[PDB]
Swiss-Prot record:
This is V(D)J recombination-activating protein 1. The chain holds residues 408 to 437 of 1057 of the full protein. Homodimer. Component of the RAG complex composed of core components rag1 and rag2. The RING-type zinc finger mediates the E3 ubiquitin-protein ligase activity. The NBD (nonamer binding) DNA-binding domain mediates the specific binding to the nonamer RSS motif by forming a tightly interwoven homodimer that binds and synapses 2 nonamer elements, with each NBD making contact with both DNA molecules. Each RSS is composed of well-conserved heptamer (consensus 5'-CACAGTG-3') and nonamer (consensus 5'-ACAAAAACC-3') sequences separated by a spacer of either 12 bp or 23 bp. In the adult, predominantly expressed in the thymus with lower levels in the pronephros, mesonephros and ovary.
DNA sequence: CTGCAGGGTTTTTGTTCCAGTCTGTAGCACTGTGTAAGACAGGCCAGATC
């Protein structure tokens, strides 16, 4: 049914790839 | 109910390469601190003996 995931500031900067996609796109379009 | 097997899942974590851009290091030929006396030999003039 998915997966529990701990908070972001403990993950590597890389770990991120998944989270900002939509914001990178929205700022670009903007 | 349990146990673990072995699949589903999302989500780490990293993967290959080509433009570059920054950053730290090795490459450069090359530098600083050792620093003052005496000992031994030979000559020979002085100077005292006598």
């Amino acid at each position: 049914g998915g997966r529990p995931r701990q908070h972001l500031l403990s993950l590597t900067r890389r770990a991120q790839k998944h989270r900002l996609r939509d914001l990178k796109n929205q700022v670009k379009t903007f």
